[PDB]
Design a binder for this molecule. Structure first.
Ligand SMILES: CC(=O)N[C@@H]1[C@@H](O)[C@H](O[C@@H]2O[C@H](CO)[C@@H](O[C@@H]3O[C@H](CO[C@H]4O[C@H](CO)[C@@H](O)[C@H](O)[C@@H]4O[C@@H]4O[C@H](CO)[C@@H](O)[C@H](O)[C@H]4NC(C)=O)[C@@H](O)[C@H](O[C@H]4O[C@H](CO)[C@@H](O)[C@H](O)[C@@H]4O[C@@H]4O[C@H](CO)[C@@H](O[C@@H]5O[C@H](CO)[C@H](O)[C@H](O)[C@H]5O)[C@H](O)[C@H]4NC(C)=O)[C@@H]3O)[C@H](O)[C@H]2NC(C)=O)[C@@H](CO)O[C@H]1O
Ligand SMILES: CC(=O)N[C@@H]1[C@@H](O)[C@H](O[C@@H]2O[C@H](CO)[C@@H](O[C@@H]3O[C@H](CO[C@H]4O[C@H](CO)[C@@H](O)[C@H](O)[C@@H]4O[C@@H]4O[C@H](CO)[C@@H](O)[C@H](O)[C@H]4NC(C)=O)[C@@H](O)[C@H](O[C@H]4O[C@H](CO)[C@@H](O)[C@H](O)[C@@H]4O[C@@H]4O[C@H](CO)[C@@H](O[C@@H]5O[C@H](CO)[C@H](O)[C@H](O)[C@H]5O)[C@H](O)[C@H]4NC(C)=O)[C@@H]3O)[C@H](O)[C@H]2NC(C)=O)[C@@H](CO)O[C@H]1O
Lengths: 152, 152
């Protein structure tokens, strides 16, 4: 049996389409796309820059016609890596979807981004753990999210 | 609990790093990167073009210093979708890694690409099944590969 990285979660709901992104190099940039002219998350982008200049990337959510009205940009820089996430799920335009999210690294907590309303979730804060990818479900918005994990 | 798409495999070996790529739209572009001046697979690229013009993409393998010496380009066009994979694992430069691969769609078999030596694997051909993503392991080369699946 070929080992796979241990999954935390996903947290959230069963709507939308499954998605998964675990690139071989470090995820160093995240985009939270907002809709509705407020801080309403509608899509997430995760990207990993390769030494050859290529960039692994995925965008999940934003599958409907919603206009993106704003973004938050998150950079995970040198000697920095993702260690945890937390956030909330709740109603946006009659959908129970991601409403806020925090990306925590070994250095800082990036966030919270969005609206801190709704049902909470948080990954397990494990000393020496690195989030090396994400998975979940999405459609118009982000229906669920979890993590792939690897120890330092 | 939050459903995830059913995994077939992975087939192969336990070396390298775990990787995973299940984009929300269809994978329409594959690159098989070769090394060594022959058809020796060293990396795989999977890409999915979104209607907004963004392109989800992952490249796995090619993590060492090897020069890319050739490629095979695979296009999965309109009314076409991936349905199965097959190939072999065997020794390349003292590593037991992917040596050949075929990408089968509802229209055509694309391949075999590489060298038809080594230990065989193939996914289950299921009427109405669609491969919606891939996962596996990789380092310098491709150590293992499997599929995410969704039915029509
Ligand atoms: C400009 C502006 O600001 N306008 C505002 C309006 O937007 C707003 O109205 C509200 O808008 C939201 C957002 O658009 C609406 O929510 C969406 O609704 C659509 C349509 O579905 C609803 O309407 C249908 C009738 O028109 C009805 O049949 C549906 O059942 C649904 O009805 C709703 O039902 C709920 C209760 O269940 C009620 O509370 C609602 O009132 C009622 N609405 C209506 C109008 O009647 C829906 O598609 C959207 O869902 C997608 O996204 C969410 C979030 O990510 C996911 O959870 C869903 O699963 C949907 O994603 C799709 O998921 C399926 C799987 O389930 C995927 O299918 C797979 O596809 C793959 C290929 O990928 C392959 O083919 C597989 O085989 C297949 O299974 C699919 O891909 C995926 N889609 C995408 C794009 O990825 C979302 O729920 C809301 O309904 C609407 N409300 C009202 C009252 O109108 C108003 C304020 O209300 O304000 C304006 O200003
Ligand atoms: C120009 C030209 O054509 N030159 C030709 C030569 O290339 C060729 O020589 C052969 O080359 C190949 C390819 O370069 C060599 O194979 C690679 O070797 C390296 C180095 O390791 C070997 O050498 C060490 C000493 O030098 C020794 O300590 C090692 O144990 C290993 O030794 C080999 O052992 C085998 C038996 O097991 C013997 O048969 C060999 O003879 C012997 N060789 C030597 C030289 O002694 C190795 O790194 C490469 O492995 C990576 O890639 C494979 C395939 O994908 C994976 O299966 C591996 O796991 C490796 O990937 C790494 O995997 C680890 C996890 O296991 C990842 O670590 C994680 O990383 C994350 C971050 O991503 C995080 O930090 C985690 O914490 C961490 O765990 C890691 O990321 C990942 N790496 C990458 C880049 O992704 C590969 O095996 C071959 O050894 C060599 N042979 C000889 C005899 O020299 C010659 C012909 O032979 O011809 C020339 O022309």
């Amino acid at each position: 049996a070929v080992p796979m990285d241990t999954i935390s979660g996903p947290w959230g709901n069963n709507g939308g389409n499954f998605w998964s992104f675990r690139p071989v190099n470090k995820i160093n940039q995240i985009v939270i796309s907002y809709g509705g002219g407020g801080n309403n998350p509608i899509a997430l982008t995760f990207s990993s820059t390769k030494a050859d200049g290529s960039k692994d990337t995925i965008t999940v959510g934003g599958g409907g016609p919603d206009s993106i009205t704003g973004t938050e940009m998150v950079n995970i820089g040198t000697d920095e890596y993702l260690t945890g996430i937390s956030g909330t799920f709740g109603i946006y335009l009659d959908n129970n979807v991601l409403r806020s999210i925090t990306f925590t690294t070994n250095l800082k907590a990036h966030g919270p981004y969005g609206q801190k309303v709704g049902t909470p979730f948080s990954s397990a804060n494990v000393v020496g753990n690195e989030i090396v990818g994400f998975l979940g479900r999405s459609g118009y918005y982000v229906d669920a999210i979890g993590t792939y994990n690897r120890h330092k």
